[PDB]
Write an enzyme that holds these catalytic residues in place. Structure first.
Site, PDB file in Angstrom:
ATOM      1  CG  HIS C  43      -0.461   0.295   2.403  1.00  0.00           C
ATOM      2  ND1 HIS C  43      -0.040  -0.693   3.283  1.00  0.00           N
ATOM      3  CD2 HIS C  43      -0.052   1.473   2.941  1.00  0.00           C
ATOM      4  CE1 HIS C  43       0.538  -0.135   4.337  1.00  0.00           C
ATOM      5  NE2 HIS C  43       0.589   1.167   4.112  1.00  0.00           N
ATOM      6  CG  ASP C  99       0.055  -3.978   2.534  1.00  0.00           C
ATOM      7  OD1 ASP C  99       0.713  -3.512   1.559  1.00  0.00           O
ATOM      8  OD2 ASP C  99      -0.361  -3.332   3.546  1.00  0.00           O
ATOM      9  CB  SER C 205       2.195   2.423   6.602  1.00  0.00           C
ATOM     10  OG  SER C 205       1.098   1.734   7.006  1.00  0.00           O
TER      11      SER C 205
END
Ligand SMILES: *[C@H]1O[C@H](CO)[C@@H](O)[C@H](O)[C@H]1NC(C)=O
Lengths: 61, 33, 257
Positions: C43, C99, C205
């Site tokens: 992502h 991911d 992230s």
């Protein structure tokens, strides 16, 4: 990806009912709040920073 | 290293025989904590 | 990071900053797995919902950094990307299943006191270390809190933050969300009654979820900060990409031998 609270009615990809995302193909009704069937718009991506010191522009090219 | 490189050994820590301030916390989690 | 603390210089020598060239901005965290390969979340590079689809040329990788915003001149290493790799079954289509991504550097980085790769685990490490109750460590320069009162202080740290979190039993991960959790994920964080807090947050992230083996003293990368429903909410958990489980992909892309 951090899902945060829906800001406008009809936004998706955000926290609508409590700490639950209102996914694609749903839309958020800023009521209680309602996560409805329907094509929402994803709450837009936040931009968190921007006080960076100068890096050699050789890299900025 | 030899074959497998020297991964996950920090020069400023493990390599100097020094522990970071919260490593212990990770270590005990293992023997309950 | 929520409820963390300032990392000590060189404590997470494998931590990488994913930096936006124009406009200048911190995209995500990452980790150094070799002198040429960087591991991040899919992502961070590809996320259609935000019409995010960066090319090798849109970004820079900043290595060996302590400071979120300073240009650490004789310490950090700034590198250009040669190529990017997104896992082919990466389901952004709301799951964030699988991911993961790899980035290859144009040139290999020189290791130092502040730059050194972490270890990818084997089956027996992954078997030993991934147990509910055991604690991993998260690092990043993301947000201090989910939300804050605008223009009163800064919700972004001046220095890398670190937090230690316990792995949560899957049934519980599962019961905490209305989202379908896959095998390629695990959740970490304290329980409400548990009396401690902390979570990863926006800007964290792509970062590493690490565990240290007592038997050989080595830091192993068990997870990648993937997603959460808010930051530090009670009865909510941070979700990590399960690295061990996707190592056959990694193996195939690096094609080291
Ligand atoms: C860039 O590639 C990704 C890979 O799937 C695709 O999803 C995205 O739509 C592309 N962006 C453009 C230029 O339309």
């Amino acid at each position: 990806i951090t899902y945060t609270d829906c800001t406008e009615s009809g936004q998706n990809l955000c926290l609508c009912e409590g700490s639950n995302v209102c996914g694609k193909g749903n839309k958020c009704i800023l009521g209680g709040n309602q996560c409805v069937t329907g094509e929402g718009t994803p709450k837009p991506e936040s931009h968190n920073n921007g006080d960076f010191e100068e890096i050699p522009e050789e890299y900025l090219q | 290293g030899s074959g497998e490189a020297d991964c996950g050994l920090r020069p400023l820590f493990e390599k100097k025989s020094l522990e970071d301030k919260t490593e212990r916390e990770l270590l005990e989690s293992y023997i309950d904590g | 990071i929520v409820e963390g603390s300032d990392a000590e210089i060189g404590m997470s020598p494998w931590q990488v900053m994913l930096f936006r060239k124009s406009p200048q901005e911190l995209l995500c965290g990452a980790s150094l797995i070799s002198d040429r390969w960087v591991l991040t979340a899919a992502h961070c590079l590809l996320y259609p919902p935000w019409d995010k689809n960066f090319t090798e040329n849109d970004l820079l990788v900043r290595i060996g950094k302590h400071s979120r915003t300073r240009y650490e001149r004789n310490i950090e290493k700034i590198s250009m990307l040669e190529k990017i790799y997104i896992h082919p079954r990466y389901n952004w289509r709301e799951n964030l299943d699988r991911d993961i991504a790899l980035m290859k550097l144009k040139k290999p980085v020189a290791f130092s006191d502040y730059i050194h790769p972490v270890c990818l685990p084997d089956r027996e490490t992954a078997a030993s270390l991934l147990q509910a109750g055991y604690k991993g460590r998260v690092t990043g320069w993301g947000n201090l809190k989910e939300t804050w009162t605008a223009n009163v202080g800064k919700g972004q740290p001046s220095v890398l933050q670190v937090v230690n979190l316990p792995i949560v039993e899957r049934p519980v991960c599962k019961d905490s969300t209305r989202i379908r959790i896959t095998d390629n994920m695990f959740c970490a964080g304290y329980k409400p009654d548990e009396g401690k807090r902390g979570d990863a947050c926006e800007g964290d992230s792509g970062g590493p979820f690490v565990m240290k083996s007592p038997f050989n003293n080595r830091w192993y990368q068990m997870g990648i900060v993937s997603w959460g429903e808010g930051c530090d909410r009670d009865g909510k958990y941070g979700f990590y990409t399960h690295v061990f489980r996707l190592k056959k992909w990694i193996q195939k892309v690096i094609d080291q031998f």
